[PDB]
Amino acid sequence: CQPTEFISRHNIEGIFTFVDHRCVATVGYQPQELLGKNIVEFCHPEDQQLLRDSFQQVVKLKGQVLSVMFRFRSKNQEWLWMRTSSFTFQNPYSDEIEYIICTNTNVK
Amino acid sequence: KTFLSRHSMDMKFTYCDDRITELIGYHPEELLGRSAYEFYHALDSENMTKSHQNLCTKGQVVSGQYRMLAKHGGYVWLETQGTVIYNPRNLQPQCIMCVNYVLSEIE
């Protein structure tokens, strides 16, 4: 079995470049399904802006983790309360954000 | 470049970014389930333990450049910032998010 928590390498647009093989036990979605898709597409319509806003906040933080709590859509197309903690990977050489992760921790 | 390192339980590798194969040489899936302490440096192992214990009681801490043991007995001088995420249900340490920063080469 796998824990109800996973990460994914996504850009500032929420586009999943590579998802960790744990989402199957979290929401049931396959990593390849998120690949090339925006996190906002599987996010609660009324909380899509909340996600977007938080994503822009982490870009302003540059090297800090921001945890946003909303209702993510599972493989059952249901809305579950999940807290996504995103961290902006800042290049140690020069100021540059390579990618942003997303620690999806199920709440209740 | 940077590298995402996931550590849980005994601070082992729960998940490793694919970029680890470009620095340490160890395949991301190969570290999955193996003890990190096994290759936790040689003389810089204390540094990891000390920072780990401190991190677990601080939440987020930055570990200085240490000699990261590669898959060929090499020591990559990389800096790493760790952030322990907590579970919002049972309120307990979930997984440690370690952001590795590539600065120097391999010793």
Curated annotation (Swiss-Prot), chain A:
Full-sequence portion shown in this chain: 358 to 465 of 789
Bilayer-spanning residue ranges: none
Lineage: Eukaryota, Metazoa, Chordata, Craniata, Vertebrata
Protein name per its UniProtKB record: Aryl hydrocarbon receptor nuclear translocator
Residue intervals of the PAS domain: 1-62
Quaternary context: Monomer. Homodimer only upon binding to a DNA. Efficient DNA binding requires dimerization with another bHLH protein. Interacts with TACC3. Interacts with HIF1A, EPAS1, NPAS1 and NPAS3; forms a heterodimer that binds core DNA sequence 5'-TACGTG-3' within the hypoxia response element (HRE) of target gene promoters. Forms a heterodimer with AHRR, as well as with other bHLH proteins. Interacts with NOCA7. Interacts with TACC3.
Domain spans labelled PAC: 67-108
Name of the gene encoding the protein in the UniProt record: ARNT
Subcellular location field: Nucleus
Function: Required for activity of the AHR. Upon ligand binding, AHR translocates into the nucleus, where it heterodimerizes with ARNT and induces transcription by binding to xenobiotic response elements (XRE). Not required for the ligand-binding subunit to translocate from the cytosol to the nucleus after ligand binding. The complex initiates transcription of genes involved in the regulation of a variety of biological processes, including angiogenesis, hematopoiesis, drug and lipid metabolism, cell motility and immune modulation.
From Swiss-Prot, chain B:
PAS domain mapped to chain residues: 1-59
Compartments, as annotated in UniProt: Nucleus; Nucleus speckle
Species in which this protein is naturally found: Homo sapiens (Human)
Stated name of the protein: Endothelial PAS domain-containing protein 1
Function text: Transcription factor involved in the induction of oxygen regulated genes. Heterodimerizes with ARNT; heterodimer binds to core DNA sequence 5'-TACGTG-3' within the hypoxia response element (HRE) of target gene promoters. Regulates the vascular endothelial growth factor (VEGF) expression and seems to be implicated in the development of blood vessels and the tubular system of lung. May also play a role in the formation of the endothelium that gives rise to the blood brain barrier. Potent activator of the Tie-2 tyrosine kinase expression.
Post-translational modification: The hydroxylated prolines promote interaction with VHL, initiating rapid ubiquitination and subsequent proteasomal degradation. Under hypoxia, proline hydroxylation is impaired and ubiquitination is attenuated, resulting in stabilization. Phosphorylated on multiple sites in the CTAD.
Portion of the full-length sequence here: 242 to 348 of 870
Gene symbol of the encoding locus: EPAS1
Distribution of this protein across tissues and organs: Expressed in most tissues, with highest levels in placenta, lung and heart. Selectively expressed in endothelial cells.
Domain PAC stretches: 63-106
Assembly mode: Interacts with HIF3A. Efficient DNA binding requires dimerization with another bHLH protein. Heterodimerizes with ARNT; heterodimer binds to core DNA sequence 5'-TACGTG-3' within the hypoxia response element (HRE) of target gene promoters. Interacts with CREBBP. Interacts with EGLN1. Interacts with VHL.
Upper taxonomic lineage: Eukaryota, Metazoa, Chordata, Craniata, Vertebrata
Disease: Erythrocytosis, familial, 4: An autosomal dominant disorder characterized by elevated serum hemoglobin and hematocrit, and normal platelet and leukocyte counts.
Signal peptide: none
